């Protein structure tokens, strides 16, 4: 891991001392180089996770998610040198400083060998993000969005902190391994129930949650594009990654005290998907779409089934790559039309042929048609839910309805139809935009050949 | 705006024959009943009571709605037709040519040169045509959307670019 | 009930501008001016064969096109599939498993040479 953590830090002195206009070029190429180094962690033994040292260890869950972060860093850097090149060098250099620091916390968080060690940097990702939304955002409501995002996740993080230190005072160290091997069946006492809520609400408030999803429309829509990918692609998985890591000392209390959360997520995703079917903002439709998929992940964890986790990891990384790509789609129009209303810029296939295509397989991948790992993600969860309860498919499949209508509805409204008459600013798609988007979908299709890597620790 | 009474009769008569054509299908019967349809039109023409006319229009179109074909005939290239804007996919705005690469632009030399003449001519005539527009605005704002023709000599009709340079109905 | 003189003149002016606009929508016989392209140095044989396109020439000329298409899209694909099947797919067990070869009484089984005895006498009832 030191083979990744140190190089990730080393970009920061380099970017801060690179030449005036070499900042993006130099940073991108080594950022791609680091992701190449991070590809080394895909190998996992048929047994205990790769434990490099007491400081850091990686399993078959962290490694697929880790590579997503490292592969991501070129994508924001390559998605941001168009809406920031008009700013001064120091502020541009500071933007790289936040992004590099944001990655470093993610790398350390996903690889933390100690539960409390996980907690610090997993929470510490707030500071680099909160700067991104509030400083470089491009709307007025970004400030209230920053408060909404920061406070909403902090309201759950603190009870987790009290819960984690309590487990320390009662069971000793919270090392992930010793926790797994030293497991005590949780009683149905009232205190254990409240301990269960503290150890869970911090992660469950973080993906979306139906009722706790109000920060995504504020944050994702108002965030800068480089940031906007991160609030939906990777940090939502931090709330995810915590769930499968923490749901090993809560069994069997999670067996019973999960119906209110399972019930909220199952019905909630139908509601929020229905929001997408009747949304006005392109980014908000994408963000609310991320809510429905992420709520599906929330459902998946709470049965504690080998098939459920097996498709849970695949769904998260598949969704994260897609949601980033769709947020690239919103950016492409946003530079030209300078507005986010959907019906403002209809008729893009006639004007931009390839960008229409890039919007095409992006929509199908969100459609979760086979064999794209979005399908292998959802379909695995369906069987796990179905075995848990047969009525689930009625609620399960009904989501597949709405996720079909709004996905093409976003496509049909924007790309197809007559082009907008009064616009005359749409130029040919920059090779940066097309190349970036190919670097999103192509590995996503390339992953389809062997999803054995992305399947997760249960496999 | 104001749809005069004799206008609606003309529209109703036009829609009646279209619907009657759909019902009759065959030409000789189409000409048969249309003449009967015509025969039951011209005799109610010399009425001095406008109240009779509007009352007549009431049950007449109430008859039209009852007797309308559930599947009326429309030519394909009309609203509801089978070729309604089916060629709209191919049409492209003219201003998109400004984004063409110079290698592509040089691959159509003479036409793009003629495009420059159109651009310069529109640029010059824009000031003249907007000046004419502001010089003859009806008091209290534009009363109707109808555009005034080019009055003087050596000018162009105001607000002409999009209608003149609209993409053809057969773009390919 | 009625091109008013103002709107009639408007339609008159707008017509001829559109007429001249379409009168500039064509292209010269030289147009499109195509840049030079590199050709594969084998088209000379066919185009020289295509100089006349005689019935004694066109059928044979199309034979090469039909032949090369046959080799490229049938011969090469069938070889790699057969190699894949013969030594990789069939190498693992039960990857090419087929239905048991249907046999009937009065037929000798190949690998044993045993003739299965004929089915016992029929009732022999016809129409």
């Amino acid at each position: 891991m030191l083979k990744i953590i140190i190089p990730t830090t080393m970009l920061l002195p380099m970017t801060w001392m690179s030449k005036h206009n070499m900042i993006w070029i130099n940073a991108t190429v080594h950022s791609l180089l680091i992701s190449l180094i991070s590809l080394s962690l895909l190998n996992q033994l048929g047994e205990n996770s790769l434990n490099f040292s007491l400081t850091f260890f990686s399993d078959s869950l962290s490694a697929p998610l880790l590579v997503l972060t490292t592969w991501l860093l070129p994508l924001m850097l390559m998605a941001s040198q168009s809406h920031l090149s008009k700013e001064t060098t120091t502020r541009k250099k500071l933007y790289i400083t936040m992004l590099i620091l944001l990655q470093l916390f993610l790398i350390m968080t996903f690889t933390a060998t100690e539960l409390i060690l996980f907690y610090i940097l997993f929470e510490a990702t707030l500071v680099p993000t909160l700067i991104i939304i509030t400083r470089w955002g491009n709307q007025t409501e970004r400030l209230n969005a920053g408060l909404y995002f920061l406070f909403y996740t902090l309201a759950g993080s603190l009870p987790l902190l009290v819960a984690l230190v309590y487990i320390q005072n009662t069971t000793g160290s919270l090392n992930f391994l010793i926790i797994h091997y030293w497991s005590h069946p949780l009683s149905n006492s009232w205190s254990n129930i409240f301990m269960w809520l503290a150890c869970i609400m911090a992660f469950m408030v973080k993906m979306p949650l139906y009722g706790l999803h109000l920060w995504l429309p504020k944050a994702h829509v108002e965030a800068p594009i480089a940031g906007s990918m991160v609030l939906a692609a990777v940090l939502l998985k931090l709330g995810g990654y915590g769930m499968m890591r923490i749901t090993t000392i809560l069994n069997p209390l999670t067996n019973y005290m999960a119906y209110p959360f399972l019930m909220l997520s199952m019905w909630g995703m139908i509601m929020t998907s229905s929001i997408c079917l009747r949304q006005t903002d392109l980014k908000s439709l994408i963000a609310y779409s991320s809510v429905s998929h992420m709520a599906l992940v929330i459902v998946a964890i709470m049965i504690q089934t080998p098939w459920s986790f097996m498709g849970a990891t695949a769904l998260m990384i598949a969704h994260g790559l897609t949601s980033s790509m769709l947020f690239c789609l919103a950016n492409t129009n946003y530079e030209r039309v300078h507005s986010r209303t959907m019906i403002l810029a209809r008729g893009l296939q006639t004007l931009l042929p390839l960008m229409a295509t890039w919007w095409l397989m992006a929509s199908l991948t969100n459609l979760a048609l086979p064999p794209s790992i979005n399908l292998i993600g959802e379909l695995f969860i369906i069987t796990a839910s179905f075995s848990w309860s047969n009525i689930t498919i009625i609620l399960m499949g009904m989501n597949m309805m709405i996720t079909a209508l709004y996905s093409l509805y976003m496509l049909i409204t924007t790309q197809r139809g007559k082009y907008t008459h009064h616009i005359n600013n749409i130029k040919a798609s920059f090779t940066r935009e097309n190349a970036l988007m190919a670097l999103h979908i192509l590995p996503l299709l390339l992953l389809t050949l062997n999803p054995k890597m992305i399947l997760g620790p249960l496999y | 705006a104001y749809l005069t009474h004799q206008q609606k009769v003309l529209r109703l008569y036009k829609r009646a024959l279209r619907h009657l054509e759909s019902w009759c299908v065959h030409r000789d019967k189409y000409r048969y009943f249309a003449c009967l349809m015509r025969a039951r039109f011209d005799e109610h023409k010399n009425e001095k009571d406008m109240v009779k006319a509007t009352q007549l229009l009431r049950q007449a179109e109430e008859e039209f709605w009852y007797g309308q074909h559930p599947q009326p005939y429309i030519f394909p290239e009309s609203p509801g037709g089978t070729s309604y804007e089916r060629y709209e996919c191919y049409k492209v705005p003219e201003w998109c040519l400004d984004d063409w690469h110079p290698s592509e632009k040089a691959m159509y030399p003479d036409y793009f040169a003629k495009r420059e003449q159109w651009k310069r001519l529109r640029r010059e005539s824009w000031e003249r045509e907007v000046k004419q527009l502001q010089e003859e605005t009806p008091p209290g704002g534009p009363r109707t959307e109808a555009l005034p023709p080019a009055r003087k000599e050596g000018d162009l009709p105001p607000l002409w670019w999009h209608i003149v340079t609209r993409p053809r109905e057969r773009p390919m | 009930s009625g091109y008013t003189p103002d709107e009639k003149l408007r339609l008159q002016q707008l017509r001829e501008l559109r007429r001249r606009w379409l009168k500039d929508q064509e292209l010269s016989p030289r147009e499109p001016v195509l840049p030079p392209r590199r050709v594969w140095p084998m088209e000379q044989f066919w185009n020289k064969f295509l100089q006349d396109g005689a019935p004694w020439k066109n059928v044979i000329y199309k034979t090469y096109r039909h032949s090369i298409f046959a080799v490229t899209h049938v011969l090469i694909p069938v070889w790699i599939i057969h190699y894949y099947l013969k030594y990789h797919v069939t190498a693992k067990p039960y990857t090419v498993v087929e239905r048991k070869p249907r046999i009937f009484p009065g037929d000798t089984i190949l690998e044993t040479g045993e003739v299965i005895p004929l089915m016992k006498e029929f009732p022999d009832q016809h129409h």
Partner: peptide
Amino acid sequence: KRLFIIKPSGFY
């Protein structure tokens, strides 16, 4: 007679 066709830039 054949005439001009208006298409978006493709070289890019």
